[PDB]
Amino acid sequence: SSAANAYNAGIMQKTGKAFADEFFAEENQVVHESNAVVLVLMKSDEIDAIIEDIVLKGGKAKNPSIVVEDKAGFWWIKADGAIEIDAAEAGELLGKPFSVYDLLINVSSTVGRAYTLGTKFTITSELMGLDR
Amino acid sequence: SSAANAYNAGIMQKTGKAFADEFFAEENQVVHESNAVVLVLMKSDEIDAIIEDIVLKGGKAKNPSIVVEDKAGFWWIKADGAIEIDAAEAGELLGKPFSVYDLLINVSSTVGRAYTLGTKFTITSELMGLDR
Amino acid sequence: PQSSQVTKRGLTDPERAAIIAAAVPDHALDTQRKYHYFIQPRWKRLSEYEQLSCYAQPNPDWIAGGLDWGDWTQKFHGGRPSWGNESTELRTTDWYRHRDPARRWHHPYVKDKSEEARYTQRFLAAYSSEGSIRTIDPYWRDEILNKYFGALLYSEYGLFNAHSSVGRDCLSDTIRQTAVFAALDKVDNAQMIQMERLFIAKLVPGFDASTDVPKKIWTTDPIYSGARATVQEIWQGVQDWNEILWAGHAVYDATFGQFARREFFQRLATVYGDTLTPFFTAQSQTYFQTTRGAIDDLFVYCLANDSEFGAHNRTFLNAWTEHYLASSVAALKDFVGLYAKVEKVAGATDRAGVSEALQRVFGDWKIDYADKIGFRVDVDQKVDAVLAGYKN
Amino acid sequence: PQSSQVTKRGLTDPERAAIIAAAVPDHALDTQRKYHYFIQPRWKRLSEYEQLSCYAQPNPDWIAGGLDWGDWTQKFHGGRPSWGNESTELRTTDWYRHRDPARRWHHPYVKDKSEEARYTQRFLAAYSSEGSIRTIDPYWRDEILNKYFGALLYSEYGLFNAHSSVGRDCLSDTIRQTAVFAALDKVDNAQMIQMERLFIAKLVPGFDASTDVPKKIWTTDPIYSGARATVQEIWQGVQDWNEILWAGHAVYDATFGQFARREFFQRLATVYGDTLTPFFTAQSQTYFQTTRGAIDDLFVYCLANDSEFGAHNRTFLNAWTEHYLASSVAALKDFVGLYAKVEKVAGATDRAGVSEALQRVFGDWKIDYADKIGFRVDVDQKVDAVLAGYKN
Amino acid sequence: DALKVNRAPVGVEPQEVHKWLQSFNWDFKENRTKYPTKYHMANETKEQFKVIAKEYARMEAAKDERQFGTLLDGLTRLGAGNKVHPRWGETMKVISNFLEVGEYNAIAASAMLWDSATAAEQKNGYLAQVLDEIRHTHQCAFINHYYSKHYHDPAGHNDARRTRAIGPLWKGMKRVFADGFISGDAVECSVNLQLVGEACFTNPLIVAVTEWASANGDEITPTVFLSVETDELRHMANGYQTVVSIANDPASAKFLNTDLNNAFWTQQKYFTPVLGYLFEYGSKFKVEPWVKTWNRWVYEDWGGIWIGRLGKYGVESPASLRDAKRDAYWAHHDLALAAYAMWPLGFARLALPDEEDQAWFEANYPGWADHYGKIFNEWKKLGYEDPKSGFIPYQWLLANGHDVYIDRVSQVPFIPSLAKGTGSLRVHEFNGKKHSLTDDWGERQWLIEPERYECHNVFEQYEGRELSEVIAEGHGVRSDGKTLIAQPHTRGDNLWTLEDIKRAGCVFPDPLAKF
Amino acid sequence: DALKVNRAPVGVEPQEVHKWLQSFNWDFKENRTKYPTKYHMANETKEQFKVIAKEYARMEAAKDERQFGTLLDG
Amino acid sequence: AKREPIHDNSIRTEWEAKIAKLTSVDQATKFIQDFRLAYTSPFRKSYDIDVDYQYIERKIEEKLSVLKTEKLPVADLITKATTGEDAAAVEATWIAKIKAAKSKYEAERIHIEFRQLYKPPVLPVNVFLRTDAALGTVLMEIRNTDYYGTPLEGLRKERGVKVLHLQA
Ligand SMILES: [Fe+3]
Numbered sequence A, B: 001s002s003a004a005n006a007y008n009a010g011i012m013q014k015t016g017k018a019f020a021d022e023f024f025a026e027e028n029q030v031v032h033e034s035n036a037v038v039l040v041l042m043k044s045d046e047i048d049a050i051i052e053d054i055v056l057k058g059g060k061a062k063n064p065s066i067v068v069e070d071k072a073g074f075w076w077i078k079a080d081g082a083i084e085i086d087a088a089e090a091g092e093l094l095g096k097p098f099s100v101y102d103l104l105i106n107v108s109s110t111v112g113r114a115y116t117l118g119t120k121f122t123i124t125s126e127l128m129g130l131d132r
Numbered sequence C, D: 001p002q003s004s005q006v007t008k009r010g011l012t013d014p015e016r017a018a019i020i021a022a023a024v025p026d027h028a029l030d031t032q033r034k035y036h037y038f039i040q041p042r043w044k045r046l047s048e049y050e051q052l053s054c055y056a057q058p059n060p061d062w063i064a065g066g067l068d069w070g071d072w073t074q075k076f077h078g079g080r081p082s083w084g085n086e087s088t089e090l091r092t093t094d095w096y097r098h099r100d101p102a103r104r105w106h107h108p109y110v111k112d113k114s115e116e117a118r119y120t121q122r123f124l125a126a127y128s129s130e131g132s133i134r135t136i137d138p139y140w141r142d143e144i145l146n147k148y149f150g151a152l153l154y155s156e157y158g159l160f161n162a163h164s165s166v167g168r169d170c171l172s173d174t175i176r177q178t179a180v181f182a183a184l185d186k187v188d189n190a191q192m193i194q195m196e197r198l199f200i201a202k203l204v205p206g207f208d209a210s211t212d213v214p215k216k217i218w219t220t221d222p223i224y225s226g227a228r229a230t231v232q233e234i235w236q237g238v239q240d241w242n243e244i245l246w247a248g249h250a251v252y253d254a255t256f257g258q259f260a261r262r263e264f265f266q267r268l269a270t271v272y273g274d275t276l277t278p279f280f281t282a283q284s285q286t287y288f289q290t291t292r293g294a295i296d297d298l299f300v301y302c303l304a305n306d307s308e309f310g311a312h313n314r315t316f317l318n319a320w321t322e323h324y325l326a327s328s329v330a331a332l333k334d335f336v337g338l339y340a341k342v343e344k345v346a347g348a349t350d351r352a353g354v355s356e357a358l359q360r361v362f363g364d365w366k367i368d369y370a371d372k373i374g375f376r377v378d379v380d381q382k383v384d385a386v387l388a389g390y391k392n
Numbered sequence E: 001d002a003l004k005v006n007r008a009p010v011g012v013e014p015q016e017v018h019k020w021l022q023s024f025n026w027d028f029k030e031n032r033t034k035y036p037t038k039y040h041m042a043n044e045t046k047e048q049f050k051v052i053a054k055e056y057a058r059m060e061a062a063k064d065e066r067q068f069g070t071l072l073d074g075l076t077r078l079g080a081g082n083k084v085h086p087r088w089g090e091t092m093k094v095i096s097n098f099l100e101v102g103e104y105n106a107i108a109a110s111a112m113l114w115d116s117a118t119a120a121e122q123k124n125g126y127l128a129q130v131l132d133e134i135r136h137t138h139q140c141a142f143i144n145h146y147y148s149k150h151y152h153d154p155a156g157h158n159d160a161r162r163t164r165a166i167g168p169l170w171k172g173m174k175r176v177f178a179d180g181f182i183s184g185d186a187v188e189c190s191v192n193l194q195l196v197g198e199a200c201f202t203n204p205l206i207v208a209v210t211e212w213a214s215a216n217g218d219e220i221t222p223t224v225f226l227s228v229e230t231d232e233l234r235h236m237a238n239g240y241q242t243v244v245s246i247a248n249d250p251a252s253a254k255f256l257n258t259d260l261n262n263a264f265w266t267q268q269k270y271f272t273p274v275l276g277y278l279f280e281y282g283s284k285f286k287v288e289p290w291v292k293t294w295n296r297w298v299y300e301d302w303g304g305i306w307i308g309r310l311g312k313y314g315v316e317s318p319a320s321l322r323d324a325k326r327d328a329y330w331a332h333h334d335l336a337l338a339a340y341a342m343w344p345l346g347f348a349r350l351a352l353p354d355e356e357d358q359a360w361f362e363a364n365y366p367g368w369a370d371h372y373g374k375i376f377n378e379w380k381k382l383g384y385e386d387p388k389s390g391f392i393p394y395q396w397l398l399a400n401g402h403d404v405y406i407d408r409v410s411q412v413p414f415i416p417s418l419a420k421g422t423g424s425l426r427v428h429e430f431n432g433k434k435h436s437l438t439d440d441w442g443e444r445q446w447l448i449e450p451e452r453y454e455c456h457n458v459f460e461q462y463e464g465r466e467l468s469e470v471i472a473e474g475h476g477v478r479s480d481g482k483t484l485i486a487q488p489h490t491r492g493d494n495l496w497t498l499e500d501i502k503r504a505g506c507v508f509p510d511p512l513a514k515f
Numbered sequence F: 001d002a003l004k005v006n007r008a009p010v011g012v013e014p015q016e017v018h019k020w021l022q023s024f025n026w027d028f029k030e031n032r033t034k035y036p037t038k039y040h041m042a043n044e045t046k047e048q049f050k051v052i053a054k055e056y057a058r059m060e061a062a063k064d065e066r067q068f069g070t071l072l073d074g
Numbered sequence G: 001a002k003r004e005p006i007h008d009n010s011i012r013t014e015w016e017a018k019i020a021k022l023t024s025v026d027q028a029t030k031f032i033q034d035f036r037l038a039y040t041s042p043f044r045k046s047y048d049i050d051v052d053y054q055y056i057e058r059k060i061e062e063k064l065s066v067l068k069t070e071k072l073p074v075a076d077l078i079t080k081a082t083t084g085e086d087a088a089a090v091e092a093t094w095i096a097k098i099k100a101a102k103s104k105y106e107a108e109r110i111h112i113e114f115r116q117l118y119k120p121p122v123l124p125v126n127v128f129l130r131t132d133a134a135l136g137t138v139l140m141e142i143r144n145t146d147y148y149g150t151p152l153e154g155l156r157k158e159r160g161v162k163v164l165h166l167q168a
């Protein structure tokens, strides 16, 4: 969810003993399946254009659970299901040659299953090769 | 001279009326021949090394009239007669390929006759083709 | 220390940065962030190439397409305008329409040529280390390549200088860029021919890379007589800048030039065991095709089809083409006498081979240029006119 | 209003920047600003290549040249060390001594190859536009180039994969860089051969760029039988990482590889009208000479002349050379059977032509490698051994 | 033979090719320049940097990669594009786009020098220069392109190639480093473009300005401009070679001092007031007084190292120098009066000097407070900044007899009743048209060469029209179609609109109707 | 033939070459890993980013130029 | 009085309607020559259309050029002025004219009138440009002889201005 995709969601809101009590709670001693993905874009002229006019416009239209946070040198993006960026759409926005490999110049990190397909970059919660 | 090669030499020390009186003095309504050269190096990793280890060492021992001033984005250098920089000596200092053409990447401005001969860049007061 | 203030940087100095932060509004004062958003895009989206190039030329409304007004601030003695319509016979509703399909502003242009510059030197160092020059036919190397490819550098050099008045005279920014990049590519071709000869001289004792013999051949050998006459005319005999570009690239260089570079030296290199020359002609032929894309756009898309002046421009372009095609056919008729000096190779240097080379050159040209401006041409008739200079 | 703090930058935020400025000493705390100033420079002054590369490998004093101490933190089941002397027969006073004469750390390596990557696509777009494929000998194109040059990609690919255990096992940083760059250059060679075939397919209807025929020829045609046997052994039959590099680059590729790439496909392209293949072989031959400079330094300067182990190392290098030279002579004896399928060209494909090609390969190899390690070789004997497979 | 060859690794360095370039030319009767020139002397000179095309591209691409790395990666991640003081970010709309046309005209001027050169080496060098001037055009555009993307006011950074046509300061920019190079003797460009333009004025215009950018928070402009000027040392050296050939020929040397003086005066006439105004009034933090920048770069260094050294060889200190020094001291303050009074015609947002600015102006130019200072403070009291005031100072100038004239030659505005710079009004009728000239040097140019100088001025084109209509017609509005690009303050609130201008009722007169 | 050919401008994009890379392996008895492993299952998977050597270099060099510009210049 | 808008106004519209009526080369040639004599250069007869004449001139040029291509044989486009004169003869005549000029005042009017009469499309572009350059060479040389020799008061008289104002 949108609230759950905040960087400081849930236990991250708590401080001091309140934080320790949940952090060491019995039920938080095993991992919990998450349907989210995390995408990190390092800041640059091209990426800042992509964030504002693609991820935060059509991207969030299609996936309202998207959260983008400012982390100084990078954008931290978390969303339910999957995040996609079409390099051809970005190249239209930038006015210069821009393949999917060019898009990767500033895609820094991914928590999830990432891959390219044509001009489009995708990071998805799906476990390809296991999920049917 | 070193005192005459300072950016704020001479009239440049004066302010207000004192400046205006010298600026409009009769003797200062024609140019005055100068034996100096001015070299501007734009700041970069390579240029800063060259400044400290060539210009301000071997260069200034050869030509004690050299004055270097920090102008934020560039180094302002003024000297009597000539300033020279050997790109081969720079390449040794930098530890990377460095031709005289590479030297020119950050040589931003020249008041004087400038030329390259071999691996050396020179800016000189001499008027080649006119002086003997 | 130093005599002058060490200026504090507003970006990092705490006191100045705080003052700046207080002065900067907390919101943007407009939402229009597209540099020169009003340019009419040629393609589905406005390109950075267009943004950085288009309307840099400060034309007034009395030069078609200009957005400024009034006369120039200072004109030539007599009244010639800084830029004017008197500079060319061709007309258009907007001199800004031209677009290089390669979208070269200065940075991609030097980025690409730098790649070629550095890779060339790596290739030469390895080629000399390989010793591959050992299998080249020595007669080709010494009597045809060194001498006649050398002499060809003078044609490339003259076409380079043909662009000097074009760079001053032409009427828009994208056209000026196209012209200047074309000129550098031509002088590069001449320099690259000379580089290959200088390189061979390091590998072949007695091989002379002086330009003395190539220059004597260019200036006095009947084989290049027609080519030199045409080049001198295109460079120094006219000043209409559209005529220079058209006659230079779309007629003379697209027929004589392509034949000499690609059908003669590049093609015969791969019949005489020359593993070196194809590295160099790969560059001239890449440059020719890039230049062609931009020349094609100016003269076909823009001038030959301009809504108001397309047929008017075709009238001049057809007159030019008739004249300079005649000049180029004579140049090729002279040039094919060179085949009398080469070792016969069936299908390459005999009459059938040379006939097929001319069919490719005149046939390609009819498709690439003549058909697009309505210039009727009988390819077989041009082939036969050139073959009259072929020694059976 | 995002959920987490918008961190203030210490470089530009006035109050953090003032705290930092108060904390930074007013003077430097040492004068030694040369990164890893203690590396012994190979050349007049320490290079950035050496500074960035040298002693990145954390070897202890019990691997010759290491500056660290003690056992590894975690070893293989059984006790195999993370890196160890058991990895190779060769010995040295210092595994760090090797220096690529091209001084390639990762940046200049991809910078150069990026140049080749982008220029190659521009050249192909121009070459297709030029139509220059029209003069290639169709038999060469279809029956020799497509099939047997295609098949050669498997040799390049196998030599590429031979480096997998080398990248893991070898004992210093500059060696590891040399090996990995050599490996990418080999898989590039294989990919570039496929790129050329895919490109011709776009130009020639009915030309099939599938690897089915090449693969079948590599795996079953007698012409490549000896070559494939050698590659399989160097790649998967041994693990001594110095034996892989020596046999792969200094013996097999320097004789069979150079013959096939340079004396067969590159040379004969310039006898059969092939204006395309030289653009591709220009890259593999440039890559071969760059690789050779680094391989030469490791085996000649460092190992065959190591002050304590030079003769010891030549004992193994001589034994390896004897074995893999015999493998390569057999590979060449098989390979020259391909000449039975080509159109005859005096001085190129006749017996005198092939003999001179083998004299260049074996004679160059004697100078470039055999003489430097004391390996006796009779050039005429190896030429005649290969010519026994030549069918006249 | 087929077995033995030297396999030492060799290539071919640029100077090995370059030594053969001189031989690339050949002799034929038509081989001569197309352009009118007075200079016909021998000019077979050597290029001082041995560039060939491949090396030209390698050098320039290396500069670019570093430059665009800093811009698109580093400075963008720092948010540097909006860390500029508003006065300076507004000043760069003008400096960069005006310099852009200077660079663009320098492409064409250098093509004329290419055409009139006779040595292949010099034709080669001028081509490299032609290329550099295209490079610099795209660099200046890239600055404003970057500001458009990253700075808090993109309007006017994003459309100056049309919105500049509205205002009168643009007219003089088309002469100073533009028409004044390309419309004239082609060999003379080695004097006006190069000996004067590049060797004198590019240093304060392109180099010294980077310190003002830095002082005011702008690290974009230093990143680009300092790279721009690296090309200039080659340009200056190209022209010096020709100057030598001119000086050595007695018939050609008898033209040089008059061409030098006319070039110097043409360039300084506009450069001196307009750049001094932009530096001092378009900054918050000042580096030094403009008149000192000018003294350092123009009078002492260019004047002594180029002109004073050449004086040994018959080149004279420009006779117009005294008049120019007076301009260096006061002409930019004169120009400020016009710039601020006519602010709606521009494409930048202006800031009246604040209290600490005024103290700095008076400290460095004693007399400023009692003249300019009192005027600016009266305008503020009348509501200069306030869109509801109905006040625009151009109408106030007229109601107190402070007419504004346009010089028919330089296009620089002149307010004779308020000016302290060099100038006096001359008004002539010729063949039924009235002309206003403003100094002895341009009046001679016009009297000798009237057909070179027919530039329409803003009062002639706008006569009788109301100010807001002219602005709207020239697209001097933000994307809402109503708020002016130009502003008389640099704040985010209370921006003026076309209706705010209209309420002032400013209509353009004919300044010469009274004569 | 010798006169007629398609002269449309074409290159070969990285994925066009990548398509054929799986076919570059060939079968021989000794074709298996040198290193000890517990894991012997079939593993004939596809690579998610279709990279070839030329495109690898182009991508990384572009990253480097931006990075070294910021460091050495700005 | 009050100027109309810059780029679209009744003067330009009215002149375009006049130009639309031109139907022959001869008629358009007399039209453009008369127009350039009446409205261009410092020696023009009228400044009544000063802010529109350059645009109007362009529109006349466009009309004359299309009429040339529709009506004239190709050889006339290369070798003849639309007055019917031989272009090379025109060149020789005007170069000799300016070289015979006895002062810069005579030379300047010869150059200015050459352009009023023969600016393209009247004369072929190539011939015109080299003629204009030869003329400009002569005119520059004579004007740049003793450029500062005449005091301003004297230059004002030689030009023949009516001095309306001289600030003290
Ligand atoms: Fe410039």
Ligand SMILES: [Fe+3]
Pocket (backbone or CB within 6 Å): E106, E133, E198, E232, E235
């Ligand atoms: Fe310049």
